Amino acid sequence: RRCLRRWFHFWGAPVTIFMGNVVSYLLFLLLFSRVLLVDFQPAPP
Amino acid sequence: VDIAQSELFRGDIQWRSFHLEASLMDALLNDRPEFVRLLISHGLSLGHFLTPMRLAQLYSAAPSNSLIRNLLDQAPPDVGHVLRMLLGKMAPWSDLLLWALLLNRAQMAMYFWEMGSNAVSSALGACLLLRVMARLEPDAEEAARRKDLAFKFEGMGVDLFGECYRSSEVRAARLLLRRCPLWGDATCLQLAMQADARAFFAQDGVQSLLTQKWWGDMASTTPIWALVLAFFCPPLIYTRLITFRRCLRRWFHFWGAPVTIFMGNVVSYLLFLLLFSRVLLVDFQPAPPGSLELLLYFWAFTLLCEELRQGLSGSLSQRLRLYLADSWNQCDLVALTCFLLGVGCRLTPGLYHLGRTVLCIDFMVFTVRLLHIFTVNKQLGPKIVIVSKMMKDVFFFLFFLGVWLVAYGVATEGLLRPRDSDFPSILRRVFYRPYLQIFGQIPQEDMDVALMEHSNCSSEPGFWAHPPGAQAGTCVSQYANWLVVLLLVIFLLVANILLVNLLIAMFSYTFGKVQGNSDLYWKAQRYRLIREFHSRPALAPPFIVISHLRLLKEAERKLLTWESVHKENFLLARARDKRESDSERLKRTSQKVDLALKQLGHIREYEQRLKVLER
Amino acid sequence: ARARDKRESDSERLKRTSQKVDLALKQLGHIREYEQRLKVLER
Ligand SMILES: [Ca+2]
């Protein structure tokens, strides 16, 4: 289908993968700090 | 082509216009600059030659799906509409030159401009057209050729004008530029402004011309201090201090000069800020606005009305857009808008504080706008431009620093485990406090456990210390405190030395690189400034209101001939210079040698035949 | 294009020009000898 073809075309482009990866990476750090500064406790995780 | 002149035009054969008409057409369609030059050189009546049908043929000869074809398709050449569209809808040679430019036949255009009439005006016009064409060109490679050709014309136009300027200063400068152009209405300079012909404005002649317009009727050599004394002593103008009914004529001459309007405006602007601060720091109160606050509101309203006039008289959408283009006009608009919000919030019963806050920021915008003054001085204008080009380095430093601050800030906070752990404070200790450490504010007693009391705060296992700082956390762990100090050492090393020094290195390199271009850019922008103040009403902003309320042939033939003669002389000198260059002499010398070798062979053959006949 | 560019360089023209001169000098000598022989035969 044309719609599916365009969808993969956009989401398969190297740039979009890069940007998508970057956004995920930032959230990872933000999650990391949240865990490290607050959620980290001697109790079980 | 050399063969044709050698053989077809050896002189042994006559020729006729009709004979050469077909060949000329072929050369034009096939882009044969040498031939078209040669054919015209042979006494061809171009004016009687060109026909509208032929002209249509040329345009039809555009290459395949060339950009020009797209414009023609969207647009019987109908060229006039095309140009009117490209610019914005604000003698055979001229037509041929226009045609050559559209098809990007560099040599063809170059030759036609040489035979043209309005050489200087045409040169800039070509420079404008190509740059617009290249910007719109999608090929992304033809644009490179168009950009190159544009530079060639601009370089040629400036070279010609310099010759004209030297020959007859008053003649060229005044009449040759200030006059209205051909194929357009905006003066010749405006064409340069549209084309962003940095080099052209960079020329000495125009700069001298602009300076003359900048000072208006007053002599361009008037000392600045002398102007200031005159400004504060209006009667003083009539003395011999300023070099240029008679009294009224002189009065308007002095007060109408662009420079005096600028200085008068600057003095008013400073007083505006001084009034602003007086209101902001003292007179601002929750009570209804006082006398001064009202005066400021009226004063600001005058600024708003003034800036409105600028945009309204920069094609409503066209003039609005170009007015918005100027960065300073953007600064004015944002400044005024914030001012309205401040007053609006100020009047509302419940938003007095918010009103004051936004005004304080607004005042910051107005003060920053004051940097426009430094764009006048020739030793500061270039500096301001260069500063604009440093933003690339600053952003690099910020992003690099921002990464490091997050890396160090979070790690330090993680080790300490402060008990406050309140989100606003967390941000303070993660970003703020580390940031200040760059500038010598290093709170050792808030991070080094050795400098803090030991006390029991939380039942959590491990040891704890009580920092004295109010925002340093009630109690911070001390498990691996040596690591915290170690990071502090690393952080200072990286941020406080490596990055800051690296930034200085980038500025040193960037400043050296863009010093040349920045100087040209300022010189070009100098015109835009002068035009802006040339049309501004004489009175100052606080009193500008009244001005707003009050607001509510053969010589040309002689001039053109004068232009052409210098162009012809300029080309001949350049062409002769080429012929006298070493390489050309070497080429011509070698050819003569071959001719000599040829005759030597013939002589040698003659001797042999004579020797045989000696019997 | 590169090879032609080299052949059109100034140095190469100078080299080729000098060689042609020597050839011209050679023929001049032969012509000079021819004139001498003809002059002798003029008797
Ligand atoms: Ca303005």
UniProtKB/Swiss-Prot annotation, chain B:
Binding residue positions for Ca(2+) 2: 307, 310, 329, 332
Organism: Homo sapiens (Human)
Protein's recorded name: Transient receptor potential cation channel subfamily M member 4
Residues modified by glycosylation: 456
Region of interest: Mediates modulation by decavanadate and PIP2-binding: 574-579
Organism domain of life: Eukaryota
Function: Calcium-activated selective cation channel that mediates membrane depolarization. While it is activated by increase in intracellular Ca(2+), it is impermeable to it. Mediates transport of monovalent cations (Na(+) > K(+) > Cs(+) > Li(+)), leading to depolarize the membrane. It thereby plays a central role in cadiomyocytes, neurons from entorhinal cortex, dorsal root and vomeronasal neurons, endocrine pancreas cells, kidney epithelial cells, cochlea hair cells etc.
Residue numbers binding ATP 2: 16, 43
Effect on the protein upon substituting residue 504 to T: In EKVP6; increased calcium activated cation channel activity; increased keratinocytes proliferation and differentiation; no effect on localization at cell membrane
Outcome, altering residue 269 to H: In PFHB1B; atrioventricular block
Gene Ontology molecular function: any one: calmodulin binding
Parent-protein residues present: 406 to 1177 of 1214
One GO cellular component term: membrane
UniProtKB/Swiss-Prot annotation, chain C:
Tissue: Widely expressed with a high expression in intestine and prostate. In brain, it is both expressed in whole cerebral arteries and isolated vascular smooth muscle cells. Prominently expressed in Purkinje fibers. Expressed at higher levels in T-helper 2 (Th2) cells as compared to T-helper 1 (Th1) cells. Expressed in keratocytes.
Consequence of substituting residue 11 to A: Decreases the sensitivity to Ca(2+)
Modification after translation, per record: Phosphorylation by PKC leads to increase the sensitivity to Ca(2+). Sumoylated. Desumoylated by SENP1.
Highest taxon listed in the record's lineage: Eukaryota
Coiled-coil blocks: 1-43
Residue segments, region Mediates modulation by decavanadate and PIP2-binding: 2-7
Function description: Calcium-activated selective cation channel that mediates membrane depolarization. While it is activated by increase in intracellular Ca(2+), it is impermeable to it. Mediates transport of monovalent cations (Na(+) > K(+) > Cs(+) > Li(+)), leading to depolarize the membrane. It thereby plays a central role in cadiomyocytes, neurons from entorhinal cortex, dorsal root and vomeronasal neurons, endocrine pancreas cells, kidney epithelial cells, cochlea hair cells etc.
Disease: Progressive familial heart block 1B: A cardiac bundle branch disorder characterized by progressive alteration of cardiac conduction through the His-Purkinje system, with a pattern of a right bundle-branch block and/or left anterior hemiblock occurring individually or together. It leads to complete atrio-ventricular block causing syncope and sudden death.
Domain notes: TRPM4, is a temperature-sensitive ion channel, it adopts distinct conformations at different temperatures, markedly influencing where and how ligands interact with it. Decavanadate (a positive modulator), ATP (an inhibitor) and Ca(2+) bind to different locations of TRPM4 at physiological temperatures or at lower temperatures.
Family recorded in the similarity comment: Belongs to the transient receptor (TC 1.A.4) family. LTrpC subfamily. TRPM4 sub-subfamily.
Record text on subunit structure and interactions: Homotetramer.
The name this protein goes by in its record: Transient receptor potential cation channel subfamily M member 4
Segment of the intact protein contained: 1135 to 1177 of 1214
